[PDB]
Structures are given as C-alpha cells and as structure tokens.
Scaffold this active site. Structure first.
Site, mmCIF file in Angstrom:
data_model
loop_
_atom_site.group_PDB
_atom_site.id
_atom_site.type_symbol
_atom_site.label_atom_id
_atom_site.label_comp_id
_atom_site.label_asym_id
_atom_site.label_seq_id
_atom_site.Cartn_x
_atom_site.Cartn_y
_atom_site.Cartn_z
ATOM 1 N N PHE A 1 13.082 85.145 -5.328
ATOM 2 C CA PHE A 1 14.041 86.133 -4.789
ATOM 3 C C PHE A 1 15.472 85.641 -4.658
ATOM 4 C CE2 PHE A 1 10.960 89.127 -4.684
ATOM 5 C CZ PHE A 1 10.209 89.341 -3.534
ATOM 6 N N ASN B 1 7.626 82.326 -14.346
ATOM 7 C CA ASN B 1 8.813 82.160 -13.504
ATOM 8 C C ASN B 1 8.438 81.863 -12.067
ATOM 9 O OD1 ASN B 1 9.674 84.435 -11.386
ATOM 10 N ND2 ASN B 1 8.409 85.397 -12.992
ATOM 11 N N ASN C 1 2.714 93.507 -10.931
ATOM 12 C CA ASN C 1 3.596 92.360 -10.935
ATOM 13 C C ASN C 1 2.992 91.236 -11.763
ATOM 14 O OD1 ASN C 1 5.573 90.441 -10.222
ATOM 15 N ND2 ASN C 1 5.817 91.406 -8.261
ATOM 16 N N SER D 1 5.262 89.710 -4.910
ATOM 17 C CA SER D 1 5.723 88.530 -5.589
ATOM 18 C C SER D 1 5.054 87.251 -5.159
ATOM 19 C CB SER D 1 7.206 88.347 -5.352
ATOM 20 O OG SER D 1 7.550 87.005 -5.575
ATOM 21 N N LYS E 1 5.013 98.077 -5.258
ATOM 22 C CA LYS E 1 4.615 97.219 -6.376
ATOM 23 C C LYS E 1 3.490 96.268 -5.970
ATOM 24 C CE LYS E 1 6.472 94.714 -10.356
ATOM 25 N NZ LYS E 1 7.764 94.432 -11.034
ATOM 26 N N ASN F 1 5.749 83.347 -5.404
ATOM 27 C CA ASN F 1 7.088 82.799 -5.434
ATOM 28 C C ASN F 1 7.837 82.908 -4.139
ATOM 29 O OD1 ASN F 1 6.305 82.412 -8.050
ATOM 30 N ND2 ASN F 1 7.846 83.714 -8.948
ATOM 31 N N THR F 2 7.338 83.712 -3.234
ATOM 32 C CA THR F 2 7.706 83.626 -1.830
ATOM 33 C C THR F 2 6.408 83.507 -1.057
ATOM 34 O OG1 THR F 2 7.991 85.982 -1.684
ATOM 35 C CG2 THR F 2 9.954 84.614 -1.917
HETATM 36 C C1 LIG Z 1 12.249 85.963 -14.602
HETATM 37 C C2 LIG Z 1 11.535 87.116 -13.939
HETATM 38 C C3 LIG Z 1 11.997 87.615 -12.710
HETATM 39 C C4 LIG Z 1 11.332 88.672 -12.082
HETATM 40 N N1 LIG Z 1 11.788 89.176 -10.868
HETATM 41 C C5 LIG Z 1 11.129 90.219 -10.239
HETATM 42 C C6 LIG Z 1 11.585 90.745 -9.022
HETATM 43 O O1 LIG Z 1 12.684 90.402 -8.537
HETATM 44 N N2 LIG Z 1 10.882 91.802 -8.454
HETATM 45 C C7 LIG Z 1 9.754 92.340 -9.040
HETATM 46 O O2 LIG Z 1 9.128 93.279 -8.523
HETATM 47 N N3 LIG Z 1 9.315 91.823 -10.227
HETATM 48 C C8 LIG Z 1 9.994 90.772 -10.838
HETATM 49 N N4 LIG Z 1 9.516 90.280 -12.037
HETATM 50 C C9 LIG Z 1 8.240 90.854 -12.601
HETATM 51 C C10 LIG Z 1 8.629 91.938 -13.611
HETATM 52 O O3 LIG Z 1 9.354 92.936 -12.933
HETATM 53 C C11 LIG Z 1 7.463 92.566 -14.361
HETATM 54 O O4 LIG Z 1 6.684 93.273 -13.420
HETATM 55 C C12 LIG Z 1 6.610 91.523 -15.107
HETATM 56 O O5 LIG Z 1 7.437 90.696 -15.896
HETATM 57 C C13 LIG Z 1 5.565 92.149 -16.010
HETATM 58 O O6 LIG Z 1 6.212 92.824 -17.064
HETATM 59 P P1 LIG Z 1 6.329 92.209 -18.546
HETATM 60 O O7 LIG Z 1 4.973 91.699 -18.970
HETATM 61 O O8 LIG Z 1 6.836 93.257 -19.512
HETATM 62 O O9 LIG Z 1 7.335 91.089 -18.485
HETATM 63 C C14 LIG Z 1 10.191 89.232 -12.672
HETATM 64 C C15 LIG Z 1 9.737 88.724 -13.891
HETATM 65 C C16 LIG Z 1 10.398 87.677 -14.533
HETATM 66 C C17 LIG Z 1 10.030 87.377 -15.957
HETATM 67 O O1 LIG Z 2 11.857 86.424 -7.618
HETATM 68 C C1 LIG Z 2 10.768 86.041 -8.070
HETATM 69 O O2 LIG Z 2 10.464 84.837 -8.121
HETATM 70 C C2 LIG Z 2 9.723 87.010 -8.523
HETATM 71 C C3 LIG Z 2 9.512 88.194 -7.821
HETATM 72 C C4 LIG Z 2 8.500 89.048 -8.252
HETATM 73 O O3 LIG Z 2 8.289 90.127 -7.638
HETATM 74 N N1 LIG Z 2 7.765 88.708 -9.324
HETATM 75 C C5 LIG Z 2 7.992 87.549 -9.982
HETATM 76 O O4 LIG Z 2 7.305 87.244 -10.984
HETATM 77 N N2 LIG Z 2 8.960 86.714 -9.588
#
Ligand SMILES: Cc1cc2nc3c(=O)[nH]c(=O)nc-3n(C[C@H](O)[C@H](O)[C@H](O)COP(=O)(O)O)c2cc1C
Ligand SMILES: O=C(O)c1cc(=O)[nH]c(=O)[nH]1
Ligand SMILES: Cc1cc(Nc2ccc3cc4ccccc4cc3c2)n2ncnc2n1
Length: 378
Positions: free
Chosen positions: A120, A116, A270, A187, A241, A189-190
C-alpha cells in the site's frame, strides 16, 4: 484509433523496458508518459452489444483497469483513453505510506506472471483526492472522457489501529468524486495477511461504509448534480475485493454477509499466495498475478456466483489477456473485467485488441449481446 504506428512504437519501447529495466521503474516511467499525455488514444466506437452494467452503473465496454495500477490517480485520463471504460484507482490510505522495501515487483515473462509486495504505497487520501478532483474538472472539458467510470479502492494504514476508522476517513474525503468504492480487505502485503475478512468483521465493515456514504448525502445541502462531482451524478456503489486464498466455508460465510449487507458488487479476485511452481519467484514474497492466477480466480467467480444465488454482480480479475479469457470470466458470472498484467506484457494495444477479440467471440457463439453471456456456463 488503430491499428497504429503510435501503438506499435510504444509497444517496441515497452518490450525493451521489459527486458532490461526494473518493473516498478518501467511502470513509473509509463505513468509519467501518461501524465504528459504523449501516449496513444483509442478513439473508436465501442460495440453497442458489449455494453454492460452493475446496477445503475453503466459501462460503455466491459474492460477496466484494476486497482494498484494508478495508486495515486496521476495518470487517469491517459489510461482511460487507451480504450478502457473504467479505472479503479488506489488502493489509498488516510495518510501516505512508502510501502515495503524495493525492489518489490518482479515479472516472469514466460508464465506471463507477476509477484509483488508493494504494501500500500500511496500518497494518501488528501493528495489523491486533489488528483481525482483535477481529473473530474478535466473530464468536463474532454470529449474522450465522457461516461468513463472512476472507482476508488480504499484500505488501511500499515500501523493502523482500526480498519473502519480508516475507511470512513477516506469516504468523507474522496467519496463525492467516486462512482464506486472498493473495500480492500484482501491484500497480502499488509499484515494479517488479509486485512480482516472474517465474516463478522466484514459485515461491520460493509455496513459502516454504506453509512458513511449515506451520511455524505444527508449532510450536504446541494442537489445531487452538485454534490456528486463524478460520472454517475449519484452516490458511489460499494464493492468489496476478495482474496482467492480462502476455504469453501469461509467463502460460504462471506457470501451470506454480502447478501445480508446488500453489497453492490464483488471484485473476484485479488492476488494469490498459493502459487509455487514459478522458478524465478521461489525466493520472493507477495501475491502472484497473471496467467497463473487465471483458473484460480475463474473457479472462485463460479463459486461466489452460486453461493450468492446469482444476486451479487461480479467484477472479474485476473489472468485476463484474451477475448476468450474475458468470455470465460463472463460465462462464470462476471459482468465486467479488470486488466492489470495484460498491460504489462501486451502493452498499449491491450484494450483495443481484447475488445475486438471479445466482439468476434460473442458473435461466433450466437450471443446477441454481452449481457446474454453472463453466468451462462452454469
Ligand atoms: C504491482 C501490483 C500492485 C497492485 N496493487 C493493488 C492494490 O493497490 N489494490 C488492489 O486491490 N489490488 C492491487 N493489485 C492486484 C490487482 O489489482 C489485480 O487484482 C491482480 O493483479 C490480478 O489481476 P491480473 O492477473 O490481470 O494482474 C496489484 C497488483 C500488482 C501486480
Ligand atoms: O499494495 C500492495 O502490496 C497490494 C495490494 C493488493 O490489494 N494486492 C496486491 O497484490 N498488492
Ligand atoms: C514494461 C513494464 C511496464 C509496467 N507497467 C506499465 C505497463 C503499461 C502501461 C501503459 C500505460 C498506458 C497509459 C498510461 C499509463 C500506462 C502505464 C503503464 C505501466 N510494469 N509494471 C510492472 N512491471 C512492468 N513492466
């Protein structure tokens, strides 16, 4: 509940959406179904042997939903009622952001991975605070929401000048309604890519956040029952995080800072930018989640547990799909687990199934309770 036709019905529908429909469209549709409360409940009792805690924050079970799932807190009740003990909403920013260009979420079914580059996207602090407030009110009258934890992930705007100015604004707006605050410096992505994780900066950042929270307590004249319209009825804990794409020295330097600042916990970890062998993702920008992240994040948990001398409680993320995955995270040093990708690929039954799997696995390994298993692999 379970096993259910209710669960089964939706898991067919979800598998259909996975094959045919855009990921972000699917997510939003299911958030919308959740908002209208037509999704299944897990009304089962959780095992008293899989309880866990972080400091004085108590979890009815060891499974929560990670940040980014419900960025705007529109669907909190329904996600919780799937059988999760907590949810981390956000990441939020002081004001609304559209995020990066769509499409920006891609799945790879066979590797059970996601990439992804959302950037934000959120409705901003004020609107999400209003959403969290309405949740808290609903929670007072909803029996299935009692003792369920809501954390808030906070970050900075894309063009924002100083990250700290942003965190403080979020804290002052939403802090009273949160059981914990997650600082999102990780993150991709920023641009950075990492919002600054450098140890001197982080230390300033952690300190500033604790202070703002402290300030809320001082400024207000109400007793705590009244001030903290949250689950704990106390001030939110502070987590950070971290991204897995750091070297041993950076990790060592961060570990010291966490000890120095007395942080309540760390979320490890993350998404990663270090994954290459996913064919469908080769043209793609962003961070990778899912099964391919699993070993990377588990190893990261081990290191930070060691570097912090077992003093800092760990929240695990991710690549967690099975009870075994969960136990691996726990034996590496995690107190609690967060799911994201698992919900995308395994559907409505994710929490019910993973809790059963872990209970059975905790039993067949001689552990009397979950807390006995924390850090035991060392
Ligand atoms: C589409 C998407 C959006 C995410 N948005 C955030 C976010 O806003 N803030 C954050 O700390 N992590 C974000 N994450 C990271 C997840 O919170 C998580 O840490 C990461 O997916 C690893 O877990 P997983 O392997 O079970 O998916 C995002 C992940 C994905 C897939
Ligand atoms: O908003 C996102 O793009 C985002 C934030 C984050 O903390 N981790 C991530 O995979 N995507
Ligand atoms: C098929 C698919 C689904 C999906 N998102 C999901 C999956 C499961 C969910 C369960 C819920 C349960 C309750 C409330 C809200 C819920 C929302 C959900 C959202 N994504 N995300 C990126 N690609 C995706 N492809």
């Amino acid at each position: 509940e379970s096993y259910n036709p209710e669960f089964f019905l939706y898991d067919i529908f979800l598998k259909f959406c996975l094959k045919y429909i855009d990921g972000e469209i699917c997510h939003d549709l299911f958030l919308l179904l959740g908002k209208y409360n037509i999704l299944p409940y897990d009304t089962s009792n959780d095992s008293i042997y899989a309880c866990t805690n972080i400091k004085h924050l108590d979890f009815i079970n060891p499974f929560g939903v990670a940040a980014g799932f419900d960025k705007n807190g529109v669907c909190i009740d329904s996600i919780l009622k799937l059988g999760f003990s907590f949810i981390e909403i956000g990441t939020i920013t002081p004001r609304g952001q559209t995020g990066n260009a769509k499409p920006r979420i891609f799945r790879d079914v066979e590797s059970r991975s996601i990439i992804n580059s959302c950037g934000f996207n959120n409705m901003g602090c004020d609107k999400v605070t209003e959403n969290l407030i309405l949740f808290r009110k609903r929670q007072e009258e909803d029996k299935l929401l009692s003792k369920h934890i809501v954390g808030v992930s906070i970050g900075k705007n894309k063009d924002t000048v100083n990250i700290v100015d942003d965190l403080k604004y979020c804290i002052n707006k939403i802090g009273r309604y949160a059981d914990y605050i997650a600082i999102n410096v990780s993150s991709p992505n920023t641009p950075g890519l990492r919002d600054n994780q450098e140890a001197g900066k982080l230390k300033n950042i952690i300190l500033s956040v604790k202070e703002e929270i402290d300030n809320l307590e001082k400024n207000n004249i109400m007793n705590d029952e009244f001030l903290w319209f949250n689950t704990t009825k106390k001030k939110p804990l502070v987590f950070v995080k971290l991204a897995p794409d750091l070297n041993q020295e950076q990790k060592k330097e961060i570990a010291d800072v966490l000890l120095e600042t007395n942080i309540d916990g760390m979320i490890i970890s993350n998404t990663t930018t270090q994954i290459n062998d996913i064919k469908s993702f080769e043209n793609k920008k962003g961070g990778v989640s899912g099964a391919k992240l699993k070993d990377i994040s588990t190893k990261f948990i081990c290191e930070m547990y060691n570097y912090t001398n077992k003093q800092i409680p760990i929240i695990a993320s991710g690549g967690i799909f099975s009870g075994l995955d969960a136990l691996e995270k726990i034996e590496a040093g995690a107190s609690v687990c967060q799911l994201y990708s698992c919900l995308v690929f395994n559907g409505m039954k994710s929490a019910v199934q993973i809790k059963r799997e872990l209970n059975h696995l905790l039993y067949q390994r001689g552990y009397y309770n979950l807390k006995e298993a924390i850090g035991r692999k060392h």
